[PDB]
Design a protein around this ligand. Structure first.
Ligand SMILES: Nc1ncnc2c1ncn2[C@@H]1O[C@H](COP(=O)(O)OP(=O)(O)O)[C@@H](O)[C@H]1O
Ligand SMILES: [Mg+2]
Ligand SMILES: [Mg+2]
Lengths: 471, 548, 79, 78
């Protein structure tokens, strides 16, 4: 019998006044349910999340949906706990909202199922497990120069329209079936038609019945886009910490989470930081990203796609997120403009597993030599631009001759890109990639045209394509 | 608790009325301070709190309100009530008022002048109002009353062929618009389980777009370029070409010049394109609040047809002016600016709008809504803030060079939104265009082997001459595919590049004369006709052609 | 042949333009008539308002006081 | 060819000008007729408006009151 009242409504932010000594704790969830009294009113069904205590029995909360129709004076109800979400085997093969309600019109989850709160602290120092194993993807530029870890955090940075979604779909297709465990896909602030396409692609391929999906997308208010990654995180944490399984976690764009936080913080009444961001960028990012770890029971392999605003890699959000990743992949627009696909930058992409004792000794030397020749070619771009190729030494011309071939051989044809171009798509194991780049570095294929190296799987295909070209 | 009456009421009657209102409102006691205002001779007008109960003199003015048997003998007069407030601040287009206790967020309020406004912020003892109109008639101390409705626009088929403003008021002077339905400006988008993949083509009539960057019904394609690259011409040609296709077009002009809007409407009326077009306008001299609601009014007008099973197409002539108007409005409210002084929700402003375009599923009816936003760049910089904001929302882009730039113009959904006849012939044309584009980069001054000297230059030059077009002359898809098929199959290689345009015109004339079976087979099957017959027809035309 | 066809097409387009102009002029005349009728109705309504106001002023308010009190009580009950 | 096209264009322009001039003449006649009808209806519907004003005042609240109201309306108009 404890009730609140609406005091202010300023966009996505509401203020509620309670009785003395009956305030809700921070992160609690409140409900508004209102039926129209006359013709000048509408029907309201809304949930709010407590954010601040302001004094004088007043709390400031964030709305999870649209606040149009709210009236100063409507009463509010305290649930007594944060947002609770259904977990277990009942969520496998379903699509969910931010609040945990299914949106695939296949029925209603029973009210007696076990539910877990969205907010919780991170695992402590005396529980984590540290070890490095290698995960195979079938991508040459990823396998060679920046291999993935089997239990860590992987990031794919990119601008706008450079190929984050295609790479994500290719990785899903290659990996999620081979994993043979459980997977979770969370989509925050992305196109709705992309999620519609992915749902049907998964249903056709059959990866469903071992996957749970959560969607909060471009058209949703900031409060919903803020707290969607936490729902998928809770769903994966249940499996890891209760069944000792190995879980995959995909996040469609982790930048939208901080962007929505920035939109909310302005109306919360906070002094802006640099470039207008919120003062609490790093704290929120760390609070999200420290729950995605591998403890002694199970592991969580997380692959995340990160957006770069205005093609600026020194923005506060990409710069802050760079520090949580074990392997990174940077996509550049200049490489995509030349037709090279994927557009991974071979010098700015890093992996912690590129060590002589982890991948081998031949792999390490091949990768280092390839990177060295690419850097040397990068150093000579200005003088080639102004003077030309006629004012170079023989060794420099040889360096350019091999560097163009290497840069073209880093490209590939994908299975999911078949509908664009027409080629069926390719898959290359590690040893074949190392062998091919070793042969390229030895001058074995120095006589073929430089165009025969584009969009092929292996080097025997390079030979066949050169043969069909009349050489 | 103040009453206005023609004559000083008896104290007993005042006590009775006060007790009645005390019982009704919920107070134990109530006292009335009657006045001696003589203007209201009809009856008593009560003002208690922020509520007013009218007298009888207003009924006479209400008689004018009932301009509309004989008015049902002046119909009937009733005690109308209203909730009011008073203004305490006004300047730069934003007001601020007392009162208005039971007002909702997003509601429409009406000033005593006659202008309308939005209720934006409901504070503890304040309401922030955004004025949608001229604010030089509003002064502190004025009275503002509620309407009881969230923001909405009038919708219907009576809007077809009319020019209106973002609130649905006609501006062409042809009389009132007789609609009978409304739709809220802010509405949710279709869900994940409400859509389906795009599988139908939208024919613009321009060869370069229809062959290289196809567009489907239900897609969101962006047209981007500098000023003075002529994107309004592309929009007008696309709207004109939909004469036969069962499509409804909507044109929204944001921040343009009213003279150019006038001439564009005149161009549309000439070609008979006003039987299926609605025009929404907000010129450069209008307030920023009105410049910012126009796309939402347009989409609200389109969704009425979309949710009935029909197909709609909407054009936003500049989103880069909506963005500037919103930045201006938000900076006057003292909100911390971000990059390039734009607010934090400038991405939300556009993403919430372009996510209402969809291809509905067959359980919902099967309607569609295509969108064509415009963005204007400075010195061809495609990596700015707003251009990258909108590139990451749509399903492709068309970059116009200061002439489509095929190195940056792409279409994702398109490709499945093409007919088979054009899908068979587009690939060769794309390869020839690429071949010329890269060859010319170095072969400006340099000898080449006969292969790269002719097959890599003459074919590209002929296709570049073929891809040109003229204003307000769209082309049917059958003629388009026939000329592209001839070019890719190998004719025109002995025709001078100065005669290809006349060759194409005479080929169209020959087709319209003696190619009825070819054209009907294409129109009926959506596949290429017999190759032998096509070659025979082309050979006959080449024989009758007078090469100059 | 082709020149005569182009001449016929030009003639047909000019005829269509002239017909559209004629339809526009007819619609303009109809709109003028509708506006004139609306203005006449507005003038009649204003004159009716003025004459009704004068008549109501001339009418006795002795019973109008009781009528106003009763109507106020009825409105209080209704609201 | 060019001469025939020019002749066709000139004839089309002449036809368009004739149609526009005929529309203008019809518009002038319609304007005169509408003005005359407006004046006549102004008189008739002014008498009718006085009668309906008496009726509206009575409804909001016989022959003698109507005559007095008509005299008052005439005085106001004068
Ligand atoms: N691996 C790839 N192979 C070929 N084309 C690609 C590839 N990745 C992206 N593209 C091009 O990029 C476009 C899609 O970009 P997308 O991945 O949707 O951008 P975003 O980074 O916003 O997800 C497609 O039209 C396609 O032509
Ligand atoms: Mg993405
Ligand atoms: Mg423009």
């Amino acid at each position: 019998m404890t009730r609140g009242r609406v005091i202010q409504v300023m966009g996505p932010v509401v203020d509620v006044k309670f009785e003395n000594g009956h305030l809700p704790a921070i992160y609690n969830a409140l409900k508004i349910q209102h039926k129209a009294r006359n013709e000048n009113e509408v029907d309201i069904d809304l949930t709010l999340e407590v954010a601040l205590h302001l004094g004088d029995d007043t709390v400031r909360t964030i709305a999870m949906a649209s606040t149009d129709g709210l009236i100063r004076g409507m009463e509010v109800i305290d649930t007594g706990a944060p947002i609770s979400v259904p977990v277990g085997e009942v969520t496998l093969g379903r699509v969910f909202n931010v609040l945990g309600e299914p949106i695939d019109l296949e029925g209603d989850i029973p009210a007696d199922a076990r539910r877990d709160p969205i907010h919780r602290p991170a695992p402590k120092f005396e529980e984590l497990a540290t070890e490095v194993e290698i995960l195979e993807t079938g991508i040459k530029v990823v396998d060679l120069l920046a291999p993935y870890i089997k239990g860590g955090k992987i990031g794919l940075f990119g601008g706008a329209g450079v190929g984050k979604t295609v790479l994500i779909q290719e990785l899903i297709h290659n990996i999620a079936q081979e994993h043979g465990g459980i997977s979770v896909f969370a989509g925050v602030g992305e196109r709705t038609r992309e999620g519609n396409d992915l749902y049907h692609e998964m249903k056709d391929s059959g990866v469903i019945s071992k996957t749970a999906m959560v969607f909060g997308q471009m058209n949703e208010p900031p409060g919903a886009r803020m707290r969607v990654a936490l729902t998928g995180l809770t769903m994966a944490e249940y499996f890891r910490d209760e069944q000792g399984q190995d879980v995959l976690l995909f996040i469609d764009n982790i930048f939208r989470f901080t962007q929505a936080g920035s939109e909310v913080s302005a109306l919360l009444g906070r002094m802006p930081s640099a470039v207008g961001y919120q003062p609490t960028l790093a704290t929120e990012m760390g609070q999200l990203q420290e729950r995605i770890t591998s403890t002694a029971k199970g592991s969580i392999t997380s692959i995340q796609a990160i957006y770069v605003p205005a093609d600026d890699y020194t923005d506060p959000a990409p710069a802050t997120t760079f520090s949580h990743l074990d392997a990174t992949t940077n996509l550049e627009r200049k490489l995509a403009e030349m037709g090279i696909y994927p557009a991974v930058d071979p010098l700015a992409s890093t992996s912690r597993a590129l060590a002589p004792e982890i991948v081998g000794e031949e792999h390490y030397q091949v990768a280092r030599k390839v990177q060295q020749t690419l850097q040397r070619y990068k150093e000579l771009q200005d003088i080639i631009a102004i003077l030309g190729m006629d004012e170079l030494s023989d060794e420099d011309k040889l360096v350019v001759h091999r560097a163009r071939r290497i840069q073209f051989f880093l490209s590939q044809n994908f299975h999911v890109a078949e509908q664009f171009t027409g080629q069926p798509g390719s898959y290359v194991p590690v040893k074949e990639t190392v062998r091919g780049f070793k042969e390229i570095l030895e001058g074995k294929y120095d006589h073929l045209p430089e165009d025969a190296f584009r969009l092929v799987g292996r080097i025997e295909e390079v030979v066949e394509k050169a043969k069909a070209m009349g050489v | 608790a103040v009453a206005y009456s023609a004559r000083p009421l008896t104290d007993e009657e005042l006590r009775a009325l006060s007790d009645v209102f005390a019982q009704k409102v919920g107070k134990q006691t109530l006292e009335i301070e009657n006045i001696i205002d003589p203007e209201l001779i009809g009856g008593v007008r009560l003002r208690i709190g922020n509520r007013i109960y009218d007298g009888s003199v207003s009924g006479q003015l209400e008689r004018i309100r009932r301009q509309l048997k004989q008015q049902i003998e002046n119909y009937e007069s009733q005690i109308q009530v209203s909730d009011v407030g008073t203004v305490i601040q006004v300047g730069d287009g934003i007001a601020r008022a007392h009162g208005l206790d039971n007002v909702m967020s997003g509601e429409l309020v009406e000033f005593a002048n006659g202008v309308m406004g939005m209720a934006l912020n409901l504070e503890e003892n304040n309401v922030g109002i955004v004025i949608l109109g001229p604010y030089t008639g509003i002064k502190e101390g004025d009275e503002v009353r509620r309407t009881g409705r969230i923001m909405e626009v009038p919708v219907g088929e009576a809007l077809i062929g009319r020019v209106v403003n973002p609130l649905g008021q006609p501006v062409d002077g042809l009389g009132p618009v007789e609609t009978t339905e409304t739709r809220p400006i802010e509405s949710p988008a279709p869900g994940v389980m409400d859509r389906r993949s795009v599988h139908e083509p939208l024919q613009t009539g321009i060869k370069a777009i229809d062959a290289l960057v196809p567009i489907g019904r239900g897609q969101r394609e962006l047209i981007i370029g500098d000023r003075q690259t002529g994107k309004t011409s592309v929009a007008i040609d696309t709207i004109i070409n939909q004469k036969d296709q069962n499509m409804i077009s909507i044109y929204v002009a944001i921040g343009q010049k009213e003279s150019t809007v006038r001439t564009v409407v005149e161009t549309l009326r000439k070609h008979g394109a006003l039987d299926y077009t609605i025009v929404v306008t907000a010129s450069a001299s209008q307030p920023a609040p009105l410049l910012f609601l126009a796309p939402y009014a347009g989409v609200a007008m389109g969704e009425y047809f979309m949710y009935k099973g029909k197909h709609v197409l909407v054009v936003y002539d500049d989103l880069s002016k909506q963005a500037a108007a919103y930045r201006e409005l938000s900076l006057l409210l003292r909100r911390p600016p971000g990059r390039e002084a734009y607010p934090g929700d400038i991405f939300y402003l556009h993403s919430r709008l372009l996510e209402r375009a969809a291809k509905l599923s067959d359980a919902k009816g099967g309607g569609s809504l295509t969108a064509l936003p415009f963005v204007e760049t400075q010195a061809g910089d495609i990596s700015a803030y707003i251009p990258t904001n909108v590139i990451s929302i749509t399903d492709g882009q068309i970059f116009l060079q200061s002439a489509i730039n095929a190195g940056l113009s792409v279409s994702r959904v398109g490709g499945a939104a093409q007919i088979k006849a054009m899908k068979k012939v587009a690939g060769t044309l794309r390869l020839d265009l690429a071949a010329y584009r890269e060859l010319e980069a170095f072969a400006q001054f340099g000898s080449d082997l006969d292969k790269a000297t002719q097959a890599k230059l003459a074919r590209g030059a002929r296709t570049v001459e073929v891809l040109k077009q003229d204003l307000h002359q769209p082309i049917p898809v059958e003629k388009q595919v026939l000329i592209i098929y001839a070019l890719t199959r190998g004719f025109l290689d002995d025709i001078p590049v100065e005669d290809v345009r006349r060759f194409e015109k005479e080929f169209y004339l020959f087709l319209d004369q003696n190619g009825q079976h070819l054209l009907e087979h294409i129109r009926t099957t959506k596949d290429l006709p017999n190759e032998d017959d096509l070659n025979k027809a082309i050979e006959a035309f080449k024989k009758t052609f007078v090469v100059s | 042949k082709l020149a005569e066809e182009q001449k016929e097409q030009i003639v047909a387009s000019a005829r269509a333009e002239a017909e559209r102009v004629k339809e526009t002029a007819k619609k303009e005349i109809e709109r003028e008539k509708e506006q004139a009728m609306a203005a006449l109705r507005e003038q009649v309504a204003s004159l009716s308002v003025l004459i009704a106001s004068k008549v109501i002023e001339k009418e006795l308010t002795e019973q109008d006081q009781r009528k106003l009190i009763e109507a106020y009580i009825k409105d209080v009950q209704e609201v």
